RNA sequence: GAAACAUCUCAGUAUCGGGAGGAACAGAAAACGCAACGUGAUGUCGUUAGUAACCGCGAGUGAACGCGAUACAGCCCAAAC
RNA sequence: GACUCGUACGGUCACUGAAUCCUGCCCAGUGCAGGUAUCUGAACACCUCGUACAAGAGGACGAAGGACCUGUCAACGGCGG
RNA sequence: AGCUUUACUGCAGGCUGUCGCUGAGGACUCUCACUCCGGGAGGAGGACACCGAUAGCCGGGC
């Protein structure tokens, strides 16, 4: 489905309407220091390594909306629940 | 052949004999070691834990 | 499954062992301090039960008896030689250096004073090529240039006993009389004729190797049967 | 003023420069052809000798054994196991190989006792100790009033029963406090967790 | 056992190798860290507590400091000279 | 340590199974083996960023292996509409 | 439970890079460790190989 780059809408942080744009969340990138991450170290050995032995699931046919709202006044964003789209393209 | 009573007749042959260590008749006299005491192998007697229950 | 035969082979039990015990002679060269003096005379031709092939005692002039790799035309009576200045004629033994190129040689050394490696099988011959103050240049019965030192010493002639193999054993009493004085299990039962658990081609309801026969170089003990390593297969092409 | 010692510590700290360096180049080449355990007349290191108890005195052994370097040489299962316990490159022994010399040298010395024992090197594929051991039946050391203690009945085969230094450190009982809940007394009261 | 099962659990159990004593082991802080102007070698008992901690964060696993007791005990080298 | 008191006319690993007449075509898949400009390819060391250090992120280089190419069926096998 | 395999997960083993042993002057010489041949003298090889550690690939042999 088609959707507008930039539109009115309210701000939870402004407490008021507002010129929000529409940017899809880019994936942050890992450190690889989390605690999950030294479990992994520490906990993995001889023989099979538990939940460190298993692989990626898999895909749904088609993936919610991930989106990030930003105000356009204060600049702050918020999200939002995503909805089923095979597709999304900005309008804009 | 049956490997039963036909073949038993052939059993002429000594083994295990008195042992002069442990009086027990386990000495082989072919190998030369006591199954019984370990008298031909071992200095120290033979002997297991799991000759008895665990806890005992 | 099981251990295959060939790993059965290794622990080295009565079976696969050479009946050592009913062999004659370790045929080695003489070691000789130097000079080349060294010289004897042949006694006997004997019958070597290791190698199916004839050997020669000898009686050399410091007393010592032994056999020795006996090339083709040695007889009793006649005198042999080992040294540096030895007689360039069959059955002495020389190094490399001092024999003459185009000359056939036998029971030859890899490395000096091993006393003797290659060709030394019934009717086969290395051929010494090239010389140099370096390098004896030797091709071996198996067709190969082996380069070396000429320090290392070999005997004159091709190995007695030629022409073995053309005689076939026509009946498996034949083979089991030889089979018999060598370290070697015999008759041999097929893999394909066995049970998957006692061999990899193992199996099935009908005789055939499971896989292709073909196996990696990098196969495990157990699993490395068939054609190992092969470049090719076939005769086409 | 500095202790003669003091030169001999300072040269081992650092056994891969200077003059040390080149004599064990040296002596590693005479040991590679020594046995198991060879008794020594003298400490290779004096300093440290002296400083674990040695003495130039009647019932006063020393030896240096060497041991092979690396993991257990441990056999593969030959029954059921779970991938946990399937390994056998990766394990290794508990027991440092320091401990493994002294013990091999007091088996050597039926009637000697282990004292302590240091480290003389290694070369790529083996480690040499050097081991102290005391005579408890020699006169000269039952009169000792510094070593006469390994001479009770208790300290008969110290080494095989760990309290030997190299035993106690090995077992974890080095820290007075935190860590040593699993150690101290004893890693076999403890349920063996240590 | 986890109602399968691989880490986990059974368990450092069973069993195996080596060795001491009448008891062993431990032990006079490179400690503790109720953070203190505080405690003061070590075992053990009671408690702290199924607490903190671990864990396909599943099933399960699981201390310590301190405190109340028992009994108390503190020393010897290496080196400097 | 066996093979081995052995050395290619050897001995190992496999298939077929005396003699006689013979044994066609197929290398795409799989296997094995050889080669390989380029692509891919781990760790150590090295460079950049980060951290008074460290974790960590990236880069450069690139072994065997793989991609790619070739050989091979008395190698697994195939020989249709 | 035995057996199979391009089932899941691992473990031996083989190949390969790297670190240690290991030294002198992306290709090269040397000798002194180390290895092998030689009864010895000495010869071959040589910082490689072996061995210890680690990494990648293959891996129903288990
Ligand atoms: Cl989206
Ligand atoms: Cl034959
Ligand atoms: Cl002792
Ligand atoms: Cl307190
Ligand atoms: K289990
Ligand atoms: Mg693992
Ligand atoms: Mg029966
Ligand atoms: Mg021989
Ligand atoms: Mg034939
Ligand atoms: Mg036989
Ligand atoms: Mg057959
Ligand atoms: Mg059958
Ligand atoms: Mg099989
Ligand atoms: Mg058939
Ligand atoms: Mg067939
Ligand atoms: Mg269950
Ligand atoms: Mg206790
Ligand atoms: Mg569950
Ligand atoms: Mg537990
Ligand atoms: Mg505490
Ligand atoms: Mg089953
Ligand atoms: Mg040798
Ligand atoms: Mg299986
Ligand atoms: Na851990
Ligand atoms: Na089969
Ligand atoms: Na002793
Ligand atoms: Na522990
Ligand atoms: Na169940
Ligand atoms: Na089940
Ligand atoms: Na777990
Ligand atoms: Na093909
Ligand atoms: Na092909
Ligand atoms: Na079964």
């Not at chain 1, 909306?65 to 939002?80: N, Q, V, W």
């Not at chain 3, 007393?63 to 004629?89: N, T």
């Not at chain 3, 030629?162 to 026509?170: A, L, Q, S, Y």
Request: net charge positive; hydrophobic share 25%.
């Amino acid at each position: 489905m088609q959707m507008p780059r930039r539109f009115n809408t309210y701000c939870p942080h402004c407490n008021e309407h507002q010129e929000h744009e529409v940017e899809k969340v880019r994936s942050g990138r890992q450190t690889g220091m989390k605690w999950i991450d030294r479990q992994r170290e520490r906990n993995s050995g001889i023989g099979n390594d538990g939940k460190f032995s298993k692989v990626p699931g898999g895909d749904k046919p088609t993936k919610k909306t991930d989106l990030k709202y930003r105000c356009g006044e204060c600049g702050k964003a918020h999200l939002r629940e995503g909805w089923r789209a095979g597709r999304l393209e900005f309008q804009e | 052949t049956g490997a039963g009573t036909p073949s038993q007749g052939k059993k002429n042959t000594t083994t295990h004999t008195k042992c002069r260590r442990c009086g027990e008749k386990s000495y082989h006299t072919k190998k030369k070691v006591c199954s019984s005491c370990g008298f031909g192998k071992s200095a120290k007697r033979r002997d297991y834990e799991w000759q008895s229950k665990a806890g005992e | 499954g099981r251990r295959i035969q060939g790993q059965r082979r290794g622990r080295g039990t009565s079976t696969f062992r050479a009946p050592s015990h009913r062999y004659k002679a370790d045929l080695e060269h003489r070691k000789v301090e130097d000079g080349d003096v060294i010289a004897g005379t042949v006694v006997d031709i004997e019958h070597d039960p290791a190698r199916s092939a004839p050997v020669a005692a000898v009686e050399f002039e410091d007393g010592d008896r032994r056999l020795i790799l006996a090339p083709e035309g040695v007889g009793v009576g006649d005198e042999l030689q080992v040294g540096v200045s030895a007689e360039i004629a069959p059955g002495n033994t020389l190094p490399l250096a001092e024999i003459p190129e185009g000359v056939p040689v036998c029971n030859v050394e890899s490395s000096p004073g091993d006393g003797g490696k290659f060709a030394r099988a019934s009717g086969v011959n290395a051929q010494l090529l090239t010389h140099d103050r370096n390098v004896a240049v030797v091709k071996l019965p198996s067709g190969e240039m082996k380069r070396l030192d000429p320090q290392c010493r070999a005997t004159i002639g091709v190995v007695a006993g030629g022409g073995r193999t053309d005689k076939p054993f026509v009946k498996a009493g034949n083979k089991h009389h030889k089979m018999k004085a060598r370290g070697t299990k015999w008759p041999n039962v097929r893999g394909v004729a066995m049970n998957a658990v006692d061999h990899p081609f193992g199996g099935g309801g009908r005789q055939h190797p499971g896989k292709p026969k073909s196996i990696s170089r990098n196969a495990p003990p157990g699993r490395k049967v068939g054609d190992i390593a092969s470049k090719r297969t076939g005769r086409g092409g | 003023a500095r202790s003669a010692y003091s030169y001999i510590r300072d040269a081992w700290e650092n056994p891969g420069d200077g003059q040390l360096a080149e004599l064990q180049w040296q002596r590693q080449q005479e040991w590679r052809n020594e046995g198991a355990v060879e008794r020594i007349e003298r400490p290779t290191r004096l300093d440290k000798a002296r400083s674990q108890g040695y003495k130039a005195k009647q019932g006063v052994i020393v030896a240096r054994v060497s041991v092979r370097k690396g993991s257990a040489r441990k056999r593969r299962h030959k029954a059921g196991r779970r991938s946990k316990r399937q390994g056998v490159t990766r394990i290794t022994r508990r027991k440092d190989i320091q401990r493994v010399a002294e013990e091999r040298a007091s088996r050597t010395f039926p009637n000697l006792r282990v004292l302590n024992s240091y480290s003389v090197g290694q070369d790529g594929r083996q480690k040499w100790h050097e081991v102290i051991l005391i005579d408890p039946n020699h006169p000269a050391i039952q009169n000792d009033d510094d070593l006469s203690w390994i001479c009770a009945d208790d300290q008969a085969d110290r080494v095989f029963r760990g309290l030997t230094g190299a035993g106690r450190r090995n077992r974890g009982l080095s820290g007075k406090g935190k860590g040593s809940e699993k150690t101290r007394p004893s890693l076999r009261s403890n349920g063996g967790k240590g």
